Design a protein around this ligand. Structure first.
Ligand SMILES: Nc1ncnc2c1ncn2[C@@H]1O[C@H](CO)[C@@H](O)[C@H]1O
Ligand code: NI
Ligand code: NI
Length: 332
């Protein structure tokens, strides 16, 4: 206001900001998946730090034992939390039902859309765009002209990554074969190891793992092979969701210390959890809206860790073309 004029002096002790309590309900994969759920949890604990809270005293996570536990975890969360995040497309139905029972609480679904509910916000990522960049990187590195893709669960969500990745490989050299296999789970490391073993054995020298915690198996396999080979004969893993450079550390047969993580796609789930938690606490929750994070707003990106300069150039060129609209990346 230009002028106020009628005013009273208020003491700082008598202004107060009402806090929110925010919880994430995570899928089979856990808060220690080194990727999707860990990004969400790192974001919530950053938000907790900023608001002077601790685990189970203003923020927490509920690990879901199975699909049946989604509803039970959301109901438990409604006991003490007024902003509740369902982390993963699979929580769609359970979040819709919980939001109808508790119209006074706010709900966020990550990686899928719920429509026509004033107390639900939906968050999606253009993982096709980051996958494309990963494809360009892979195409510019593969010596065997074969690369692997290990998906978690067949879905709109993982199909975005797969379509982007194939389009990205094809944009550089369509002669490169892309072996695709799904694990049927985001929390099955042993299946990730088996699938990686076969993709590498069949002559893939790079595997992109888009399977959350299942990906720990892909890392374990690549490490095993690379530990029993010369440095210059190593096989690569592409990281997902977080920068997974740290998981790529090994000692070759040769005795050289090295890293088998080529690049990582980034998905800023943690940043989204923190920003929406702050909006919820300020009484500006984006209920009923669909928030789309893409390459332009850096909600997805590629970390170019151990890529060659030729690869880094091809990634920067592809990135610019996606941002300007010259390349439209397929979603299926
Ligand atoms: N536990 C999970 N539940 C649902 N989707 C998941 C889970 N872990 C990973 N994903 C999906 O797989 C992608 C690659 O890890 C993530 O960006 C996310 O879309
Ligand atoms: Ni004023
Ligand atoms: Ni007055």
């Amino acid at each position: 206001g230009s002028s106020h004029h009628h005013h009273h002096h208020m003491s700082g002790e008598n202004l107060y900001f009402q806090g929110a309590s925010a919880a994430i309900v995570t899928d089979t994969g856990g808060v220690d998946d080194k990727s999707f759920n860990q990004s969400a949890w790192e974001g919530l604990q950053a938000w907790g730090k900023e608001h002077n809270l601790s685990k189970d005293n203003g923020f927490t996570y509920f690990q879901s034992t199975s699909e049946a536990d989604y509803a039970n975890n959301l109901q438990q969360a409604a006991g003490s939390y007024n902003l509740i995040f369902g982390v993963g497309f699979a929580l769609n139905n359970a979040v819709k039902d919980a939001a109808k029972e508790h119209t006074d609480l706010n709900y966020v679904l990550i990686d899928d859309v719920i429509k026509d509910q004033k107390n639900v916000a939906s968050v999606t990522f253009a993982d096709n765009e980051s996958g494309y960049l990963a494809g360009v990187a892979a195409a510019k590195t593969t010596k065997t002209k074969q690369v692997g893709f290990v998906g978690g669960i067949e879905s709109e969500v993982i199909s975005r990554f797969e379509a982007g990745f194939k389009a990205g490989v094809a944009s550089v050299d369509p002669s490169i074969k892309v072996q695709v296999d799904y694990a049927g789970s985001f929390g099955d490391a042993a299946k990730g190891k088996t699938i990686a073993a076969a993709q590498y054995a069949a002559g893939a020298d790079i595997v992109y793992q888009v399977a959350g915690g299942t990906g720990a198996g892909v890392f374990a396999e690549a490490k095993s092979l690379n530990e029993s080979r010369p440095e210059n004969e190593k096989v690569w893993v592409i990281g997902v969701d977080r920068d997974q450079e740290a998981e790529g550390k090994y000692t070759s047969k040769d005795g050289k210390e090295s890293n088998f993580v080529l690049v990582s796609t980034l998905k800023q789930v943690g940043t989204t959890v923190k920003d929406i938690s702050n909006k919820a606490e300020r009484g500006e929750f984006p209920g009923g809206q669909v928030i789309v994070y893409s390459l332009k707003d850096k909600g997805v990106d590629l970390a170019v860790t151990n890529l060659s300069e030729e690869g880094k150039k091809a990634v920067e060129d592809a990135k610019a073309k996606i941002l300007d609209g010259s390349v439209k990346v397929p979603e299926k």
